[PDB]
Amino acid sequence: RPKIVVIGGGTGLPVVLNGLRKQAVDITAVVTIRNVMVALSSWPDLYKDIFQGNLIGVFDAVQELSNMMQVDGHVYPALTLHGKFSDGTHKSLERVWVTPQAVQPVIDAIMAADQIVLGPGSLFTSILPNLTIGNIGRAVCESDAEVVYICNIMTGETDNFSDADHVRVLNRHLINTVLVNTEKVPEDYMDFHSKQVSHDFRGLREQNCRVISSNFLKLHDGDQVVAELMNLVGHSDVFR
Fold it and tell me: 54: which residues sit within 8 A by CB, 6+ positions away?
């Protein structure tokens, strides 16, 4: 029974997270929340409907709520973010950091974990503010769990980046495999409703990173994504 630890954000988190739920696995989300709950919540749906309201410290509540909301799994968690720009701390976040102690319970998960997932979500705003915190950032790196990164479908922070650049930006802040979306998001579509992460194989490889390229685009999928996520932790030595 694989052990997946997740760390991401944005509207993409409850998609893949809601994906790991239907699966046989011990889910763990390092958040910093409503979706993360409804997502891993086992509640009917009539109930989940009502939850969406928000009128209902953090760690306590959540850890209380999770169990109130029949959440087979754990959704762990002040702190405030800084940003060290391409100068001056609207421009280009070149490294943000949060200022702090990682809650003993999380690192324990990261450790015993088989697969640590990071993303979807912004690099500097979602994924980093949780890793940057040294104590949790060493767990990702001393772990016998394989780290996997679901690269964003799109791109001041990340303008003109590529799968490579993203990974690079992460590592620099302190990754085993990357889930790269090869599906093309269409002009007139983006027009109808910024750019799309480019694809550079080498830079990604030259970073001791594996490349899993497929169709993760939906108009990421989540189930298609949870698929590679599930095939990954299934054949990995760490799990077997």
Answer: 34
